[PDB]
Amino acid sequence: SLGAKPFGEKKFIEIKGRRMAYIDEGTGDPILFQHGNPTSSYLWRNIMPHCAGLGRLIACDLIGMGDSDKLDPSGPERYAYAEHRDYLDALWEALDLGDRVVLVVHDWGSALGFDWARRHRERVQGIAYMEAIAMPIEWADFPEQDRDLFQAFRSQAGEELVLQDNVFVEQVLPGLILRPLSEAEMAAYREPFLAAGEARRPTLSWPRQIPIAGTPADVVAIARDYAGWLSESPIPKLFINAEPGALTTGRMRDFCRTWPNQTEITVAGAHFIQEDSPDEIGAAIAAFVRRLRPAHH
Ligand SMILES: [Cl-]
Ligand SMILES: [Cl-]
Ligand SMILES: [Mg+2]
Ligand SMILES: [Mg+2]
Ligand SMILES: [Mg+2]
């Protein structure tokens, strides 16, 4: 259903000195749901129930996000892709996931999960993705309506826009959900970013890592590598397409449609499509997993 309640209470593991938070429910091989910017495990609350009894249902909060601890010191060099990967790789190792993981990914969760999959391919049973950073892009490929604002985040304007005015949370997020959010929903998204200043840095560092027009070169190289790998990987895939969508449209969507061993559905939504079409998304994921894990009830 739609609904503002969280899916479970947070659990905690110590990673590199910092407590990291994650949702963990059920038993069996993992189904690992990974949010991006500026969300948390909360993004998946109405999707995870569809997988009840199909696996161990896990949704991690990235470092500095959700209920995971903030890094200190923080500033413009903090919360880059590589640092998020360092923490997330360690958390995923700590969770004792085994070798039949189904990844369910969105936004920067897809960049992180696609790279992890490339590096751990024998451990990935299937990949469900939506509104993903599937490859390096050009500014022409970026949604027109928020193009100027994302170039501003990437400029020195970003500190005022995000650290002081919290634009990513307060404007971009609700602007890329078709339906109006309730107070309680918006409160869950605001919670990690209530405080002005470096508490909000993850939401500014993230748009500064998007691989656009060859910059930043280090993330472009990472995405070029997972794009090349996914396009010839035999791992089963589920592409949850969106209309109108946002990022996984145009050239990127065409590229994703070339990937082998893939199923597709289309749901209504812009970018944070989990808030518009959770039951359609969840049902597709559950069907995918049932195929991958035949129960013979
Ligand atoms: Cl971003
Ligand atoms: Cl660069
Ligand atoms: Mg209690
Ligand atoms: Mg501590
Ligand atoms: Mg001014």
Curated annotation (Swiss-Prot):
**InterPro entries recorded:** AB_hydrolase_1 (IPR000073), AB_hydrolase_fold (IPR029058), Epox_hydrolase-like (IPR000639), Haloalkane_dehalogenase_2 (IPR023594)
Keyword terms of this UniProt record: Detoxification, Hydrolase, Periplasm
- Briefly describe activity regulation: Competitively inhibited by the key pollutants 1,2-dichloroethane (1,2-DCE) and 1,2-dichloropropane (1,2-DCP).
In UniProt terms, what is the effect of altering D107N? 58% of wild-type activity
Q: What switches on its expression?
A: Constitutively expressed.
Q: Which is one Pfam family of this protein? A: Abhydrolase_1
Gene Ontology terms: biological process: response to toxic substance
In which residues is chloride bound?
N37, W108
Outcome reported for the amino acid change (mutating E243Q): 38% of wild-type activity
Q: Under which EC number(s) is this enzyme classified?
A: 3.8.1.5
Q: According to the UniProt record, what happens if one changes F168L?
A: 31% of wild-type activity
Q: What is the pH dependence? A: Optimum pH is 8.2.
If you read the UniProt record, what top EC class would you report for this enzyme, in one word? hydrolase
Substituting W108L results in:
Loss of activity
Q: Which reaction does it catalyse?
A: 1-haloalkane + H2O = a halide anion + a primary alcohol + H(+); (3R,6R)-1,3,4,6-tetrachlorocyclohexa-1,4-diene + 2 H2O = 2,5-dichlorocyclohexa-2,5-dien-1,4-diol + 2 chloride + 2 H(+)
**Pathway of action:** Xenobiotic degradation; gamma-hexachlorocyclohexane degradation
**Record: active site:** D107 (nucleophile), E131 (proton donor), H271 (proton acceptor)
- GO MF term set: haloalkane dehalogenase activity
Provide the protein's localization.
Answer: Periplasm
Effect caused by changing F150 to L/W/Y = Increase in activity
Question: Which PANTHER family does the protein's record reference?
Answer: EPOXIDE HYDROLASE
What does the sequence similarity comment in the record state about its family? Belongs to the haloalkane dehalogenase family. Type 2 subfamily.
Give a short account of what the protein does. Answer: Catalyzes hydrolytic cleavage of carbon-halogen bonds in halogenated aliphatic compounds, leading to the formation of the corresponding primary alcohols, halide ions and protons. Has a broad substrate specificity since not only monochloroalkanes (C3 to C10) but also dichloroalkanes (> C3), bromoalkanes, and chlorinated aliphatic alcohols are good substrates. Shows almost no activity with 1,2-dichloroethane, but very high activity with the brominated analog.
Q: What protein am I looking at?
A: Haloalkane dehalogenase
Organism whose genome encodes this protein: Sphingobium indicum (strain DSM 16413 / CCM 7287 / MTCC 6362 / UT26 / NBRC 101211 / UT26S) (Sphingobium japonicum)
Q: Which gene encodes it?
A: linB
